[PDB]
Amino acid sequence: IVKCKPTSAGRRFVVKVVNQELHKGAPYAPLLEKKSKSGGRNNNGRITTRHIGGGHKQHYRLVDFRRNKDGIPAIVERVEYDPNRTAHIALLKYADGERRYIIAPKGVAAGDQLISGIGAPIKAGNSMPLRNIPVGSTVHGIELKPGKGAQIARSAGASAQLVAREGAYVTLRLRSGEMRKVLAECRATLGEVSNSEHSLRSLGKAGATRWRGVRPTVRGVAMNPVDHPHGGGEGRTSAGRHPVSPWGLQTKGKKTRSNKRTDNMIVRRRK
Amino acid sequence: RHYEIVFLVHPDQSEQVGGMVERYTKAIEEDGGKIHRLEDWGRRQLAYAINNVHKAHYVLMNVECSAKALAELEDNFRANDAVIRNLVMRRDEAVTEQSE
Amino acid sequence: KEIDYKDLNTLKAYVSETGKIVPSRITGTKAKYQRQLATAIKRARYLALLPYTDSH
Amino acid sequence: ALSVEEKAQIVNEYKQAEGDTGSPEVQVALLSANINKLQDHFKANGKDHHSRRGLIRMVNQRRKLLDYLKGKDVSRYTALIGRLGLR
Amino acid sequence: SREFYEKPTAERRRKAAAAVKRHAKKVQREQRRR
Amino acid sequence: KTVVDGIAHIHASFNNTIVTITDRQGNALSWATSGGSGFRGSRKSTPFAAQVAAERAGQAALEYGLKNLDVNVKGPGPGRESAVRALNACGYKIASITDVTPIPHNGCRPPKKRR
RNA sequence: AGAGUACGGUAGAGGGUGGUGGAAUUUCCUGGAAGGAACACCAGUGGCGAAGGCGACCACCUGGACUGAUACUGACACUGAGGUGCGAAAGCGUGGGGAGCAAACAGGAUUAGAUACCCUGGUAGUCCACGCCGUAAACGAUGUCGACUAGCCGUUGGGAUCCUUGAGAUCUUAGUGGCGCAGCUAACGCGAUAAGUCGACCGCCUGGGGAGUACGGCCGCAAGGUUAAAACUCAAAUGAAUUGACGGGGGCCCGCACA
């Protein structure tokens, strides 16, 4: 965390997060692949998510969310920057060549770690089935179907706390604040994700948004009646509607979950 | 220096105190430590609930290394084994015997 | 001589029936060691020789 | 304090009719050795100013013992300022 | 008993009023016999 | 259901009375309060209420017996020693008290010294 | 001789880091699971630190004095404007936590009214890391230091004397207290820890308001703090003490005052 001096009117509010033990260039080439941008656009060519476009060219890193090698110890080579996410990634070298990327946990640099059916818990970074993880311990990178890979708690500094256990399932409080029953056959990694000071950085200037591939938001009271329901009016009007999307869905409080096929898996909502 | 050992066992675990002790007795003799007492307590009853059971057994030894046989003396049983709520309580001289 | 918590029936003569320790105003022991007894009391209390509550 | 091996070690060059432990070869340079080795605990304990107020109490008294050697003996003062890694 | 909590400035209004009485009991009894 | 042994709570705080009668393992058989016999208000900060609040669970623990009980004590205020001598009048031969008064070491600080 | 060090020995909430705890209470749920915070007793007209300050248990890296003497230094001294660090908590920073209470409030009962004490509820906060403020009923409302002038009773740490079994006297000191002469004091009262007799030095005061306030300087993100005036205005404000009166001040007593 550094705070830039105001030598120009754009650096006045740039709070920058710089890690000096991140690796200095040349990511691990046999484990990257090509990734082109969508612009938020369908296979019908239609903008289906707005405010997406531009940015920097990026390569996709084949980060392992499954952590399948069991019993084979992996040493950590280096922690790298990943353009595709807000977390860091750690290059692991298994005991038989076999480089892979995982999501880096907090406190890793050249440490040892092994995902298995019964690995050491003290080391944060060991992937493990949710049956034999001790209750009360903070985990991240939780699978949600066995074999599917990690899906939950994998942003920067994200974690979930394993709170209870019964039957074939296991209950864990999520970072969202909601209690979620998850199957105990599926894996999780002990610890907490690495780049937890990511919420401190300030972008500073409008260009810093534009090179993350994010594109400006016209707010709907600035549009015409044909463009948005927040219509027009003379002067600054205030959306005489109730506040609503550009497609007419109400936005300030209205619930939009309608899944029903996974409601029993959610033991308590965001409270 | 003079370093007074007390560590706990679970009462279903005490079949291998004869294996628990002998690793510490060679954890000390790698560093020239003189043992001046080696005690096995009475199988006494408990005054409070520790790991929600109603029986235990106590162990007493006396380490006289300098420094190196402490951090493993902790972390064999502090991290993961059947020992709970101890105190390491170093001394200044040697003693002979207790438990009658 | 050098008091400790290995001699139980000496300290148990000062251990209250309700689990507590006695002051110097109740029973006569030295105020020199009244600051040293209570520390050795809570090593027998920590090594489960004496209770914390008077129930169990 | 200082180490039991060390506090009896460092006197072995401060001797000067060896029964002296009182001349300012001793209360400078035992005490200079007190300065140089007890820097350690500050890096771990930086929230306790009780231990470096003793440092400034005797590094002044070292300088007070330097102050008397300014006039009484300038020649043996060179054994202090030239040595020990001062200034 | 512990319905209320006492301010730690009033803590020397409870004990320091009482710790004199511990000593003043010695005062009254030694002035009792004479 | 025919049992003969159990334990017995008495809540004895300043304002109200709460009586709680269980078995020796912890299943409640009978209970009554100082707002139990129809008071609801200004009077019953008394041991006369605990005289009455004992016997509404003293002729209700005579549903499943309890020839012997085990008195557990709880609370600072009145009705402390004027309620467990009402149960024994109701055909009981209760033996001796047992005390767990709520005592922290320092604990959470209450509403402080009000004036 | 003052002042310092080489040698242990304890005493000691010195202070900080990391853990290990317990009961309540609190929050859930079918007695367990979960985490915050201060740690009943030991508690002391006790210790410790220049001061501010500081108590469960446990190690770990570390202070200064005391004392028992034995060694050596040869006034190296104390005090000190400026100068320089370091100083309770509400704070507001810059990041987190999360129980109870509770600053902020909503009503509940209450009064001409609550905007109050009482009643039902809760974010900032205390906690942590670095950093800033540098405030005080920082009070023992008594600057630091040394010397000396009747005592007596507890109590703290050493040590030696002691018929000695200590149930312990005496002595010796360095602290912490009670009471009292000499002594001072306006009196209250201090009274070898002076508020005496003195000595060195330092900070501070010059009637009450205006006022620790304006203005200027410095520091702070802000709230503000620190240094600090006159213009005007009043012949008094203040200190301890005594008589009377008063008191929703206590304590006894009297009377159909209470039946």
From TrEMBL, chain B:
UniProt entry tagged with the keyword rRNA-binding: yes
Gene Ontology CC: one annotated term: cytosolic small ribosomal subunit
GO molecular function: small ribosomal subunit rRNA binding; structural constituent of ribosome
Keywords: Ribonucleoprotein, Ribosomal protein, RNA-binding, rRNA-binding
GO biological processes: translation
Family the entry assigns: Belongs to the bacterial ribosomal protein bS6 family.
Function according to Swiss-Prot or TrEMBL: Binds together with bS18 to 16S ribosomal RNA.
Protein name in the entry: Small ribosomal subunit protein bS6
Originating species: Pseudomonas aeruginosa
Lineage, uppermost ranks: Bacteria, Pseudomonadati, Pseudomonadota, Gammaproteobacteria, Pseudomonadales
Gene: rpsF
TrEMBL record, chain C:
MF-aspect GO terms: small ribosomal subunit rRNA binding; structural constituent of ribosome
Protein's job: Binds as a heterodimer with protein bS6 to the central domain of the 16S rRNA, where it helps stabilize the platform of the 30S subunit.
The species this protein was found in: Pseudomonas aeruginosa
Residues of the full protein shown: 19 to 74 of 76
Protein name (Swiss-Prot/TrEMBL): Small ribosomal subunit protein bS18
GO cellular component, one term: cytosolic small ribosomal subunit
Keyword match Membrane: no
Gene: rpsR
Superkingdom as given in the UniProt entry: Bacteria
Keywords: Ribonucleoprotein, Ribosomal protein, RNA-binding, rRNA-binding
The UniProt record lists the keyword Nucleus: no
GO biological process, one term: translation
Family that this chain belongs to: Belongs to the bacterial ribosomal protein bS18 family.
Subunit and interaction comment: Part of the 30S ribosomal subunit. Forms a tight heterodimer with protein bS6.
Automatic annotation (TrEMBL), chain D:
Keyword Ligase: no
UniProt record, GO biological process: translation
GO cellular component, one term: cytosolic small ribosomal subunit
Record key words, sorted: Ribonucleoprotein, Ribosomal protein, RNA-binding, rRNA-binding
Short name of any one Pfam family annotated for the protein: Ribosomal_S15
InterPro entries cross-referenced by the UniProt entry: Ribosomal_uS15, Ribosomal_uS15_bac-type, uS15_NS1_RNA-bd_sf
Single GO molecular function: structural constituent of ribosome
Entry function: Forms an intersubunit bridge (bridge B4) with the 23S rRNA of the 50S subunit in the ribosome. One of the primary rRNA binding proteins, it binds directly to 16S rRNA where it helps nucleate assembly of the platform of the 30S subunit by binding and bridging several RNA helices of the 16S rRNA.
Subunit structure: Part of the 30S ribosomal subunit. Forms a bridge to the 50S subunit in the 70S ribosome, contacting the 23S rRNA.
Family: Belongs to the universal ribosomal protein uS15 family.
Record's protein name: Small ribosomal subunit protein uS15
Gene that this polypeptide is encoded by: rpsO
UniProtKB/TrEMBL annotation, chain E:
Positions with biased composition (Basic residues): 15-26
Annotated segments matching region Disordered: 15-34
Biased composition range(s): Basic and acidic residues: 27-34
Family: Belongs to the bacterial ribosomal protein bS21 family.
Listed name of the protein: Small ribosomal subunit protein bS21
Organism: Pseudomonas aeruginosa
Lineage: Bacteria, Pseudomonadati, Pseudomonadota, Gammaproteobacteria, Pseudomonadales
